[PDB]
Amino acid sequence: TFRNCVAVDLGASSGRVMLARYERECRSLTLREIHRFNNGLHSQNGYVTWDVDSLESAIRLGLNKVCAAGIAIDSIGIDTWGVDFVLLDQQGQRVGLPVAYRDSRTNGLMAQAQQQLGKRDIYQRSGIQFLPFNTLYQLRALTEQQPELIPHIAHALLMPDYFSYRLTGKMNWEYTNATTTQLVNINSDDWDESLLAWSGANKAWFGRPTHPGNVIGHWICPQGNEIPVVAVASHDTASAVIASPLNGSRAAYLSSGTWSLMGFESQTPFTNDTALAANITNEGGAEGRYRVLKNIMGLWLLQRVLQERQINDLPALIAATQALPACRFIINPNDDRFINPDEMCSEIQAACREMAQPIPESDAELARCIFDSLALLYADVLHELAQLRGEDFSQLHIVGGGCQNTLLNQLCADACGIRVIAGPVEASTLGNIGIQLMTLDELNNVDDFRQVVSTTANLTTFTPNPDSEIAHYVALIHS
Ligand SMILES: Nc1ncnc2c1ncn2[C@@H]1O[C@H](COP(=O)(O)OP(=O)(O)O)[C@@H](O)[C@H]1O
Ligand SMILES: OC[C@@H]1O[C@@](O)(CO)[C@H](O)[C@H]1O
């Protein structure tokens, strides 16, 4: 009577196959990691790409581990990073390369679109923030730079639907992730004609976006039995918001991983002048609850400093960084220069040096710079979001792998002057499981699920410290 649901959660920095156990009467939700594997950017033939074949094999591995365990699997669901896509021919074979959002092929194309179509217009249609790597500009890059592929393309599937197709044989176009493309019209919940036209993409490459909960198809363990594959809120960030234990209207979330996604939930989008000027997005959510958020470059900066400096002990680095004075090195992480520079440490140091600031040179200094610069931006965005909706936030829920960074959790509380609740760590996985359970009729809605999470997950509270270094700094920048 307990249900066994599998989440496949693929991030930019890592992928995971996880198993969850749940039953209504007990209200208990347990997560088990089945298969953890690495994901990252591969330089392939002058492009920055994803190794989709290795991921699928890794996904199959994880699933086959659950079948051979002799576990009755009630459902499977896949969530990944947004924006990206895979092209398929008439037979199902991939067309072209699976290009990552970190690729430079889109450079300049966003500016061209705002010039040709109008900044206001694209925003009124999509309600999606302008990011230079949006699918709208990715498809322009493809149609302009590779026009010999066009005739072969029959279908375009976003990453999670691609992997759902590979397991089932059935194509899906999941709503919450479809919205990350800047190609869906916010008033119709279907693909925008004019935006598709500018991108050069064909409307027939896509089906009508469908809201989370439908069964895409089925997957077969090496013995026979059918396991339903559910279209979850397939955008990883959409899943993480679902699993965030939000306490009604005045709670904000920060989905913290490679990216920091800061926002709130609304039943109505914000597409006015204030939202455009602040560059807010209205990404699709479960239940039609718009995820009104902003992208913050996030721990991507730390990830890159780790590799380049050859640091294999992150907790040790964080512990040392805590001994260093706050807010002496400040950059703007959302600067385009940080999207994918060759030398991250040099970029961060160059940016500091340009502002006549002392140069962060040690490992701890570079981490200090990153954590402090993020926390100040967290503060800025939170003010921007509260000012937009005309309402304060009582608490900030930090979820994701980044929520294990207790230093950054406290810095964020202190800079934002707000109570921080950290947890759950694997929010995307949990939200993925959450939707499956509703499809199985084990769970009634998202509010139902968030109560399970808030009485199941480990939640750590961070109280904002007014006499903190970063708090001192933030009060100073007011007058
Ligand atoms: N033990 C830890 N302490 C502090 N931070 C951590 C720890 N483990 C992971 N992180 C942070 O979490 C990030 C990855 O989080 P995750 O939500 O998995 O991101 P993504 O889904 O983008 O891969 C890492 O960049 C790292 O900074
Ligand atoms: O797709 C690129 C970025 O990756 C995320 O999905 C988080 O992993 C963000 O929501 C999206 O803006």
Swiss-Prot record:
Task: Spell out the catalytic residues.
Answer: D236 (proton acceptor)
The UniProt keywords, alphabetically, are: ATP-binding, Disulfide bond, Kinase, Magnesium, Nucleotide-binding, Rhamnose metabolism, Transferase
**Cofactors named for this entry:** Mg(2+)
Molecular-function annotations in GO: ATP binding; glycerol kinase activity; rhamnulokinase activity
Residues engaged in binding ATP: A12, S13, S14, G15, R16, T258, Q303, G401
Could you tell me what this protein does? Involved in the catabolism of L-rhamnose (6-deoxy-L-mannose). Catalyzes the transfer of the gamma-phosphate group from ATP to the 1-hydroxyl group of L-rhamnulose to yield L-rhamnulose 1-phosphate.
Q: Which family does it belong to?
A: Belongs to the rhamnulokinase family.
Q: How does this polypeptide assemble, per the annotation?
A: Monomer.
What is this protein's record name? Rhamnulokinase
Q: Which organism is it from?
A: Escherichia coli O157:H7
- Which gene is this protein's source? rhaB
